[PDB]
Amino acid sequence: GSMRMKQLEDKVGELLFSNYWLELEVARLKKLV
Amino acid sequence: GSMRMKQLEDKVGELLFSNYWLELEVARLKKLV
Numbered sequence: 001g002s003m004r005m006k007q008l009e010d011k012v013g014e015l016l017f018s019n020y021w022l023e024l025e026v027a028r029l030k031k032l033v
Numbered sequence: 034g035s036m037r038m039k040q041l042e043d044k045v046g047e048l049l050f051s052n053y054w055l056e057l058e059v060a061r062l063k064k065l066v
Contacts (some may be wrong), residue, residue, distance in 0.1 A: 005037060005038060008042060015052060022052065026055060026059060032066050
């Protein structure tokens, strides 16, 4: 129905992915400092 | 307006801000190790 909505849905998924990996990186760094 | 579109936009905005916050935190921590 809505290609606009698909694009935003996709971006939510991409950002959830990126944020997961950034959180993991922060946690690894907290174990290192 | 569209509740679905605005909810998507809102979630993208929140995730983008968190992403940026996390990148700043990674950079802060990387300076130390």
